Design an enzyme around this catalytic site. Sequence first.
Site, PDB file in Angstrom:
ATOM      1  N   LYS B 100     -18.304 -90.782  55.302  1.00  0.00           N
ATOM      2  CA  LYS B 100     -17.842 -92.145  55.030  1.00  0.00           C
ATOM      3  C   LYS B 100     -17.135 -92.705  56.270  1.00  0.00           C
ATOM      4  O   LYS B 100     -16.747 -91.947  57.153  1.00  0.00           O
ATOM      5  CB  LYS B 100     -16.904 -92.184  53.796  1.00  0.00           C
ATOM      6  CG  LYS B 100     -15.929 -91.004  53.644  1.00  0.00           C
ATOM      7  CD  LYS B 100     -14.978 -90.791  54.843  1.00  0.00           C
ATOM      8  CE  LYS B 100     -14.120 -92.026  55.147  1.00  0.00           C
ATOM      9  NZ  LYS B 100     -13.255 -91.886  56.370  1.00  0.00           N
ATOM     10  N   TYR B 185     -10.831 -95.024  50.649  1.00  0.00           N
ATOM     11  CA  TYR B 185     -10.455 -94.103  49.567  1.00  0.00           C
ATOM     12  C   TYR B 185      -9.845 -94.831  48.366  1.00  0.00           C
ATOM     13  O   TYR B 185     -10.035 -94.421  47.211  1.00  0.00           O
ATOM     14  CB  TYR B 185      -9.461 -93.041  50.054  1.00  0.00           C
ATOM     15  CG  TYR B 185     -10.077 -91.993  50.964  1.00  0.00           C
ATOM     16  CD1 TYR B 185     -10.137 -92.198  52.339  1.00  0.00           C
ATOM     17  CD2 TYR B 185     -10.600 -90.798  50.441  1.00  0.00           C
ATOM     18  CE1 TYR B 185     -10.698 -91.255  53.177  1.00  0.00           C
ATOM     19  CE2 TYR B 185     -11.170 -89.838  51.280  1.00  0.00           C
ATOM     20  CZ  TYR B 185     -11.213 -90.077  52.652  1.00  0.00           C
ATOM     21  OH  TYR B 185     -11.769 -89.149  53.513  1.00  0.00           O
TER      22      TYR B 185
HETATM   23  N1  LIG Z   1     -14.242 -87.129  54.731  1.00  0.00           N
HETATM   24  C1  LIG Z   1     -13.097 -86.964  55.480  1.00  0.00           C
HETATM   25  O1  LIG Z   1     -12.101 -86.457  54.919  1.00  0.00           O
HETATM   26  C2  LIG Z   1     -13.131 -87.356  56.898  1.00  0.00           C
HETATM   27  C3  LIG Z   1     -14.207 -88.085  57.362  1.00  0.00           C
HETATM   28  N2  LIG Z   1     -14.280 -88.460  58.701  1.00  0.00           N
HETATM   29  C4  LIG Z   1     -15.435 -89.236  59.222  1.00  0.00           C
HETATM   30  O2  LIG Z   1     -16.108 -88.407  60.177  1.00  0.00           O
HETATM   31  C5  LIG Z   1     -16.545 -89.207  61.308  1.00  0.00           C
HETATM   32  C6  LIG Z   1     -15.870 -88.689  62.611  1.00  0.00           C
HETATM   33  O3  LIG Z   1     -14.512 -88.546  62.350  1.00  0.00           O
HETATM   34  P1  LIG Z   1     -13.658 -87.537  63.515  1.00  0.00           P
HETATM   35  O4  LIG Z   1     -14.417 -86.273  63.399  1.00  0.00           O
HETATM   36  O5  LIG Z   1     -12.247 -87.688  62.991  1.00  0.00           O
HETATM   37  O6  LIG Z   1     -13.886 -88.336  64.879  1.00  0.00           O
HETATM   38  P2  LIG Z   1     -13.818 -87.410  66.246  1.00  0.00           P
HETATM   39  O7  LIG Z   1     -13.629 -88.491  67.258  1.00  0.00           O
HETATM   40  O8  LIG Z   1     -12.787 -86.327  66.096  1.00  0.00           O
HETATM   41  O9  LIG Z   1     -15.284 -86.715  66.410  1.00  0.00           O
HETATM   42  C7  LIG Z   1     -16.182 -87.717  66.776  1.00  0.00           C
HETATM   43  C8  LIG Z   1     -17.406 -86.976  67.361  1.00  0.00           C
HETATM   44  O10 LIG Z   1     -18.620 -87.727  67.226  1.00  0.00           O
HETATM   45  C9  LIG Z   1     -19.410 -87.458  68.400  1.00  0.00           C
HETATM   46  N3  LIG Z   1     -19.781 -88.734  69.074  1.00  0.00           N
HETATM   47  C10 LIG Z   1     -21.068 -89.257  69.289  1.00  0.00           C
HETATM   48  N4  LIG Z   1     -21.061 -90.428  69.961  1.00  0.00           N
HETATM   49  C11 LIG Z   1     -19.702 -90.682  70.188  1.00  0.00           C
HETATM   50  C12 LIG Z   1     -19.033 -91.740  70.824  1.00  0.00           C
HETATM   51  N5  LIG Z   1     -19.744 -92.798  71.375  1.00  0.00           N
HETATM   52  N6  LIG Z   1     -17.658 -91.758  70.923  1.00  0.00           N
HETATM   53  C13 LIG Z   1     -17.018 -90.682  70.362  1.00  0.00           C
HETATM   54  N7  LIG Z   1     -17.510 -89.618  69.723  1.00  0.00           N
HETATM   55  C14 LIG Z   1     -18.887 -89.634  69.648  1.00  0.00           C
HETATM   56  C15 LIG Z   1     -18.558 -86.492  69.354  1.00  0.00           C
HETATM   57  O11 LIG Z   1     -18.943 -85.260  69.130  1.00  0.00           O
HETATM   58  P3  LIG Z   1     -19.892 -84.514  70.445  1.00  0.00           P
HETATM   59  O12 LIG Z   1     -18.808 -84.407  71.471  1.00  0.00           O
HETATM   60  O13 LIG Z   1     -20.342 -83.228  69.745  1.00  0.00           O
HETATM   61  O14 LIG Z   1     -20.933 -85.580  70.653  1.00  0.00           O
HETATM   62  C16 LIG Z   1     -17.134 -86.749  68.839  1.00  0.00           C
HETATM   63  O15 LIG Z   1     -16.389 -85.559  68.992  1.00  0.00           O
HETATM   64  C17 LIG Z   1     -16.101 -90.678  61.006  1.00  0.00           C
HETATM   65  O16 LIG Z   1     -17.141 -91.351  60.375  1.00  0.00           O
HETATM   66  C18 LIG Z   1     -14.938 -90.470  60.021  1.00  0.00           C
HETATM   67  O17 LIG Z   1     -14.765 -91.536  59.132  1.00  0.00           O
HETATM   68  C19 LIG Z   1     -13.255 -88.071  59.598  1.00  0.00           C
HETATM   69  C20 LIG Z   1     -12.190 -87.372  59.185  1.00  0.00           C
HETATM   70  C21 LIG Z   1     -12.025 -86.942  57.776  1.00  0.00           C
HETATM   71  O1  LIG Z   2      -8.790 -90.763  59.776  1.00  0.00           O
HETATM   72  C1  LIG Z   2      -9.062 -89.855  58.740  1.00  0.00           C
HETATM   73  C2  LIG Z   2     -10.093 -90.462  57.826  1.00  0.00           C
HETATM   74  O2  LIG Z   2     -11.286 -90.672  58.545  1.00  0.00           O
HETATM   75  C3  LIG Z   2     -10.323 -89.460  56.721  1.00  0.00           C
HETATM   76  O3  LIG Z   2     -11.407 -89.859  55.925  1.00  0.00           O
HETATM   77  O4  LIG Z   2      -9.145 -89.295  55.955  1.00  0.00           O
HETATM   78  C4  LIG Z   2      -8.178 -88.652  56.764  1.00  0.00           C
HETATM   79  C5  LIG Z   2      -7.808 -89.527  57.949  1.00  0.00           C
HETATM   80  O5  LIG Z   2      -6.896 -88.833  58.772  1.00  0.00           O
END
Ligand SMILES: NC(=O)C1=CN([C@@H]2O[C@H](COP(=O)(O)OP(=O)(O)OC[C@H]3O[C@@H](n4cnc5c(N)ncnc54)[C@H](OP(=O)(O)O)[C@@H]3O)[C@@H](O)[C@H]2O)C=CC1
Ligand SMILES: O[C@@H]1[C@@H](O)[C@H](O)OC[C@H]1O
Lengths: 335, 335
Positions: B100, B185
């Site tokens: 999401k 959420y």
């Molecule tokens: N369900 C939940 O509880 C959560 C859901 N999320 C969702 O997960 C997704 C990512 O969140 P998060 O993991 O916190 O974000 P991060 O920034 O920690 O990880 C993002 C990753 O996506 C990849 N990526 C590809 N293109 C890009 C770009 N242009 N800029 C940056 N990163 C890029 C990279 O991985 P690489 O280096 O391998 O390309 C980067 O590490 C979002 O959609 C967020 O809403 C996030 C946290 C909790």
């Molecule tokens: O940013 C994060 C959000 O993407 C996740 O879904 O819920 C936890 C937050 O910290």
Amino acid sequence: RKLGYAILGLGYYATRIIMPRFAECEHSRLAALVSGTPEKLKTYGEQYGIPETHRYSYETFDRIIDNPDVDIVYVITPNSLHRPFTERAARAGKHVMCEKPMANTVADCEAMIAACKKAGRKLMIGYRSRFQAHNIEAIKLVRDGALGPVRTVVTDHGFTIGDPKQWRLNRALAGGGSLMDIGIYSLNAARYLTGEEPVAVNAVESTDRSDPRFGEVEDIINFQLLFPSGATANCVSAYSVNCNRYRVSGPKGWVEIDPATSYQGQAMRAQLGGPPAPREPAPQPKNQFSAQLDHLSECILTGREPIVGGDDGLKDLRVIEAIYRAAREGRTVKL
Amino acid sequence: RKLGYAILGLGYYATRIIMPRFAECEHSRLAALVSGTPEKLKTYGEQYGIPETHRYSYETFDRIIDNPDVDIVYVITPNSLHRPFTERAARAGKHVMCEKPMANTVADCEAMIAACKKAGRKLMIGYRSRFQAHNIEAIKLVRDGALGPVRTVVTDHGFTIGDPKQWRLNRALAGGGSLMDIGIYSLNAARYLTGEEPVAVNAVESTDRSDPRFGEVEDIINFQLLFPSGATANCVSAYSVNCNRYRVSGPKGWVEIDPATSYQGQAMRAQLGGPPAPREPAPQPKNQFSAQLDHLSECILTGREPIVGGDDGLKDLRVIEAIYRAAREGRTVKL
Ligand SMILES: NC(=O)C1=CN([C@@H]2O[C@H](COP(=O)(O)OP(=O)(O)OC[C@H]3O[C@@H](n4cnc5c(N)ncnc54)[C@H](OP(=O)(O)O)[C@@H]3O)[C@@H](O)[C@H]2O)C=CC1
Ligand SMILES: O[C@@H]1[C@@H](O)[C@H](O)OC[C@H]1O
Ligand SMILES: NC(=O)C1=CN([C@@H]2O[C@H](COP(=O)(O)OP(=O)(O)OC[C@H]3O[C@@H](n4cnc5c(N)ncnc54)[C@H](OP(=O)(O)O)[C@@H]3O)[C@@H](O)[C@H]2O)C=CC1
Ligand SMILES: O[C@@H]1[C@@H](O)[C@@H](O)OC[C@H]1O
Ligand SMILES: O[C@@H]1[C@@H](O)[C@H](O)OC[C@H]1O
Ligand SMILES: O[C@@H]1[C@@H](O)[C@H](O)OC[C@H]1O
Ligand SMILES: O[C@@H]1[C@@H](O)[C@H](O)OC[C@H]1O
Ligand SMILES: O[C@@H]1[C@@H](O)[C@H](O)OC[C@H]1O
Ligand SMILES: O[C@@H]1[C@@H](O)[C@H](O)OC[C@H]1O
Ligand SMILES: O[C@@H]1[C@@H](O)[C@H](O)OC[C@H]1O
């Protein structure tokens, strides 16, 4: 030393809640009774040692002008009656404590304020929460900057109302539904927690008109407030659920009370630099009811203005009108 | 019997939260890694025993069509990249788990749904809370009539976001501010607690554009929902306060969770006939993350549709567009 109260309208709040609480007052005493029920005058006159000379019907009430033992009239009637009894009390040369909601409309509040001003008498609205230990603690935390700037206030007030025949569900006597009776606590709290007045209002109403309770007034009306600082409030007002709480939050933390504005049982929790923990408020000299009563008396004694004067009640009615309008028109109302 | 996941986008959520939870899965296994950072492919490939044959860059990702060990691609990228990696995954003959918010817009969600339908592959959105014990218990209480009809849902989600340079605060990558990331959420919960879809939306935005964090996307956007049954919701979405909770209330009582949708630490309190009291939810066989992973795998193994399919993500984006529009136009948006 002690100013004399006439209690007018010997219903539930007057008899169960307010009148016993003169016990802890330091500057207020029960001096007289005003009632449309002769039996109540006898019953309570006897319990509280109020002589027949100090008992009034609604028909003889204006004669209270000639009773020097009465300084203040406390109007505790259905909402639509606040204005005429306030005005009569003022013309009788008495200061006035008026229960919330102040009146049905903005114009009615303005009329009340004008009549008390003309009489050179003080007017206070019964917002007892401003004297309640936990509420005072929350307000002070905000003012001290413990939260940083207020960003959100989330506050829910409601109870499951019962008997369909009661005056609160009668538009002619109540002036409106849950918002007038209990949702006003949400509004009033959003105002004293932020210390601001709203500049924009949203609202949604939801009432089942097939419910025998809700032919005339509203059940749920929830609203949003925006303040000039950027602070926001989400508020619930309801006659079909039980809730009584608020949480105020800023970038540095938050504080909540649940129940927040009940007669007793307040419990506060704060999150201020660590996980949430119970917080005990600084002790107050006396309970919120006795404190409310003494506040008006002390203002009169010292020539000061009440912290919750007619203008505070008017400010609520202004926003209440906007809330009803926002729900009716399905648009943001600007103030 | 375990289906193979390819994890795409090796950021915080993928590597700190999701990948360790394959341990408790009964029908899912980590099969491949897709990353734009070569050193991450080596580090996590070595840690999880993923051979070089099962490591892909974004450049070589489409070759995954020829890897029969991969059944599912789990897209865990910035929001704006959900649609193209989902579409490419689908064209590679893979089922898709997508984090999401599903995508930036309704149109993009529709495109993702169409691509997976065309591929004859399943699509599920990462709404893990639907697999979390306390959330399941709240839904059960509502469904079983413990509250009576749902009248109010009051739900707040936010956190104090930090680094201004991160993709969440960049419109091109995030698609929107707090509502896209954390306010969703509140919305998702209002929908699964009522089991209904909103017919009217109010909203208020509050963002300090002089804050280095908020040059491009919103900080606070609070919204109201009305549902066909008459149920209502008041919701907070914020990037400048910390909150994570909901209470759902009906005439017979209420239940709340605080924190509600966090990774762990959920605590439930319910008011059901008597005073508010702690409530322990029915145990779940495994944690919300492993349960989420296995749910898609089991849907594929059994020929069933996910409980949180693409259409659930779409339904959230429909309301999210309406929330943004209501705040912009200052009117109630009808759906
Ligand atoms: N369900 C939940 O509880 C959560 C859901 N999320 C969702 O997960 C997704 C990512 O969140 P998060 O993991 O916190 O974000 P991060 O920034 O920690 O990880 C993002 C990753 O996506 C990849 N990526 C590809 N293109 C890009 C770009 N242009 N800029 C940056 N990163 C890029 C990279 O991985 P690489 O280096 O391998 O390309 C980067 O590490 C979002 O959609 C967020 O809403 C996030 C946290 C909790
Ligand atoms: O940013 C994060 C959000 O993407 C996740 O879904 O819920 C936890 C937050 O910290
Ligand atoms: N601050 C607080 O915490 C509270 C404030 N209130 C406010 O106090 C006021 C009264 O509330 P409550 O005491 O609960 O109401 P009740 O119905 O319990 O008592 C109302 C009294 O007003 C008098 N009255 C005069 N005319 C009428 C009339 N036409 N119909 C009915 N009663 C009439 C009666 O007293 P008599 O028989 O002596 O004429 C009646 O008993 C309201 O404005 C309410 O909002 C109420 C509860 C708590
Ligand atoms: O799981 C929770 C437990 O940890 C505690 O906080 O009491 C209530 C429960 O909901
Ligand atoms: O509401 C009033 C009730 O409080 C009183 O006891 O009897 C008279 C009613 O009008
Ligand atoms: O003493 C009070 C009595 O006067 C009233 O009638 O009922 C409540 C009691 O607390
Ligand atoms: O005393 C009140 C009386 O004046 C009114 O007419 O009916 C309700 C009573 O409570
Ligand atoms: O109806 C009552 C209302 O008038 C009071 O102000 O708050 C408590 C409620 O029970
Ligand atoms: O440019 C992107 C980079 O920011 C990310 O961290 O690794 C994947 C690349 O596509
Ligand atoms: O709160 C403000 C919002 O209304 C505006 O549209 O975007 C800028 C913000 O400052």
